Write a protein that binds this ligand. Structure first.
Ligand SMILES: CCCCCCCCCCCCCCCC(=O)O
Length: 127
């Protein structure tokens, strides 16, 4: 349902966010303009997602409504719960970051908010 492969079209406030969260500037620099790929496999409430940005491949999984460990941008793994807010929307919060992922047709919009910082990503189905 969320299942598919998607690639980044555009994003806002990437570096603000990534510095604030602790990403090595050596990585935030080379990452600014990468159009990353997301491969998602949803099976009921079971989700697997791989996010590929260059040589950095992060793979995660979670079951909706359960506790799950998620590997973060920095490599830090956090224990949280991901919830559905409608079949088309994934919502979680970790390290004071609120992440919203919403699929509309072939476009996935992801929003992460740390304080006043709103990091938004817009991706498009590919393969
Ligand atoms: C590496 C950061 C982990 C993100 C934590 C969000 C948990 C739900 C995410 C499900 C798949 C995310 C959608 C990918 C779209 C995108 O790359 O912006």
């Amino acid at each position: 349902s969320f299942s598919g492969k998607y690639q980044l079209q555009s994003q806002e406030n990437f570096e603000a966010f990534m510095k604030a969260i602790g990403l090595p500037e050596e990585l935030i620099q080379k990452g600014k303009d990468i159009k990353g790929v997301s491969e998602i496999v949803q099976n009921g409430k079971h989700f697997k997602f791989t996010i590929t940005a260059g040589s950095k491949v992060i793979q995660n999984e979670f079951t909706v409504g359960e506790e799950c460990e998620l590997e973060t941008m920095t490599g830090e793994k956090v224990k949280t719960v991901v919830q559905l807010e409608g079949d088309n929307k994934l919502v979680t919060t970790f390290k004071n970051i609120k992440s919203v992922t919403e699929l509309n047709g072939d476009i996935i919009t992801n929003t992460m908010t740390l304080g006043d910082i709103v990091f938004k990503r817009i991706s498009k189905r590919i393969g």
